[PDB]
Swiss-Prot record, chain A:
May form homodimer. Interacts with the P protein. Transmembrane segments: none annotated. This is Large structural protein. It comes from the Viruses. The chain holds residues 2080 to 2127 of 2127 of the full protein.
Swiss-Prot record, chain B:
Belongs to the rhabdoviruses protein L family. This is Large structural protein. Transmembrane segments: none annotated. It is found in: Virion; Host cytoplasm. Changing S104L: In strain: Isolate SAD1-3670 var 1 and Isolate SAD1-3670 var 2. It comes from the Viruses. May form homodimer. Interacts with the P protein. RNA-directed RNA polymerase that catalyzes the transcription of viral mRNAs, their capping and polyadenylation. The template is composed of the viral RNA tightly encapsidated by the nucleoprotein (N). The viral polymerase binds to the genomic RNA at the 3' leader promoter, and transcribes subsequently all viral mRNAs with a decreasing efficiency. The first gene is the most transcribed, and the last the least transcribed. The viral phosphoprotein acts as a processivity factor. Capping is concomitant with initiation of mRNA transcription. The lineage of its organism: Viruses, Riboviria, Orthornavirae, Negarnaviricota, Haploviricotina.
Length: 48, 145
């Protein structure tokens, strides 16, 4: 919260997905989201 | 007993998670930081890197992560980078993409498991709150309880 000083955020969920995918290709270079869905149960609640 | 009934009607614990979510989305940052100086606010970046290195993550990687998080502009990209911290954390521990060529699986201690679970569920709860999703919030409340 002290990093992001705004709750009640707004924006496209699609943009979050694509941005996370891009940052992941940058940082880890190995994993993607299709290796994650129904295999870690992290993003099984949101729509990302 | 009558006042007890009215208290069981409003005590902020038996109320709906819809109401609690709306509260947490209602209150703001400025109303809670203003007046105080810029000194009592501990540098969140230092605490972030400290907790991550406490979780046995690569110092170079997490430092680069936190520096990009500081430098970037935009609430969206910042929370996306946060989720990136989450996934890289949950991949450094609980190595998924590693083919695990050996047959011996040595899982980590229960403390590390609790740390992992808490950070994950907290991040996801904050995100659901930012997006306002009551069934996910209820499910996460269920996980915690």
């Amino acid at each position: 919260y002290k990093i992001v000083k705004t709750t009640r955020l707004v924006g496209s969920i699609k943009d979050l997905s694509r941005e996370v995918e891009r940052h992941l290709h940058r940082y880890n270079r190995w994993i993607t989201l299709e290796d994650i869905r129904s295999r870690s149960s992290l993003l099984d609640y949101s729509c990302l | 007993s009558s006042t007890l009934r009215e208290m069981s009607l409003v005590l902020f614990n038996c109320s709906s998670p819809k109401s609690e979510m709306q509260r947490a989305r209602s209150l703001n940052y400025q109303d809670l930081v203003r007046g105080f100086p810029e000194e009592i606010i501990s540098n969140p970046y230092n605490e972030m890197i400290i907790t991550l290195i406490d979780s046995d993550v690569e110092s170079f990687l997490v430092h680069k992560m936190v520096d990009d998080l500081e430098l970037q502009r935009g609430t969206l990209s910042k929370v996306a980078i946060i989720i990136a911290i989450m996934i890289v954390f949950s991949n450094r521990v609980f190595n998924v993409s590693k083919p695990l060529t050996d047959p011996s699986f040595y899982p980590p201690s229960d403390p590390k498991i609790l740390r992992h679970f808490n950070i994950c569920c907290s991040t996801m709860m904050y995100l659901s709150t930012a997006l306002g999703d009551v069934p996910s919030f209820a499910r996460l409340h269920d996980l915690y309880n």
